[PDB]
């Protein structure tokens, strides 16, 4: 169904580490893929262009961004500050799984994360709507300099966002 592609670059303290791209299954979910697409260009009054990261745990997951409005916890979606779910036809095969984050039922703000392992306890809760085709190496490189204390390579920030129209 001519699935779109999206990406964004990571900066390790005023230094470009590399780009990470993602392929979305708009074929399966031609609705929630757009949410992600828009969050790149980061119009509509939000996106990943906030140059900030939440946290990076080595050997679990990696992401950050979005929100930015309420003391670093903003976040509204293109369908509102909340949005229903779709389904769980997809599963968590392991690392390289792009899954959403949620804070309740029919409550999918926007923020997602990369699964760098078999998050079997997240399967069925989070929506899988894409995978990491290429960039896992950069993600790994990023995680290598992460920690559970909620600090990463000094101060990693989103350099720029992509959106491959």
């Amino acid at each position: 169904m001519v699935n779109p592609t999206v990406f964004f670059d990571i900066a390790v303290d005023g230094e470009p580490l590399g780009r990470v791209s993602f392929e979305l299954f708009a074929d399966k979910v031609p609705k929630t893929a757009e949410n992600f697409r828009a969050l790149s260009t980061g119009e509509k009054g939000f996106g990943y262009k906030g140059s900030c990261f939440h946290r990076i745990i080595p050997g679990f997951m990696c992401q950050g961004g979005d929100f930015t409005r309420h003391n670093g916890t903003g976040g509204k979606s293109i369908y509102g500050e909340k949005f229903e779910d779709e389904n769980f036809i997809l599963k968590h095969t392991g690392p390289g799984i792009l899954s959403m984050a949620n804070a309740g039922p029919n409550t999918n703000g926007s923020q997602f994360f990369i699964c760098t392992a078999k998050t079997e306890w997240l399967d069925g809760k989070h929506v899988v709507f894409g995978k990491v085709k290429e960039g896992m190496n950069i993600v790994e490189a990023m995680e290598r300099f992460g920690s559970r204390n909620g600090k990463t390579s000094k101060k990693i920030t989103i350099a720029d966002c992509g959106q491959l129209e």
């Binding site: 745990i57 916890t73 976040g75 984050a101 703000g109």
Partner: peptide
């Protein structure tokens, strides 16, 4: 812990 929600991450 190792959860991924959106509001008040705990251990």
């Amino acid at each position: 812990x190792l959860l991924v929600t959106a509001g008040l991450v705990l251990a």
